[PDB]
Amino acid sequence: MPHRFKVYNYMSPTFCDHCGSLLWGLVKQGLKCEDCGMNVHHKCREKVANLC
Ligand SMILES: CC(C)CC(C/C=C1\C[C@@](CO)(COC(=O)C(C)(C)C)OC1=O)CC(C)C
Numbered sequence: 917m918p919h920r921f922k923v924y925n926y927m928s929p930t931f932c933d934h935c936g937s938l939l940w941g942l943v944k945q946g947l948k949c950e951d952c953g954m955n956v957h958h959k960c961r962e963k964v965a966n967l968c
């Protein structure tokens with residue numbers, strides 16, 4: 917069952933659960949899965965394994 921990612925706004929240092937680097941920026945820094953809470957970069961979304 918695929919993840920359900922949404923653009924999200926982080927307020928404390930958060931890493932991409934896919935590629936390991938920081939989600940940089942002030943707002944809209946990445947995507948959070950509605951169902952499991954995984955955080956990923958916008959570009960990493962298509963690369964994550966899609967078993968939520
Ligand atoms: C409250 C919100 C509207 C802004 C706030 C968000 C805080 C973040 C974003 C994040 C997420 O990984 C990445 O931070 C960065 O890239 C910075 C800190 C270098 C910008 O880590 C944080 O602690 C940041 C400002 C107070 C400077």
Ligand SMILES: [Zn+2]
Nearest residue numbers: 919949952968
């Ligand atoms: Zn998920």
Ligand SMILES: [Zn+2]
Nearest residue numbers: 932935957960
């Ligand atoms: Zn990433």
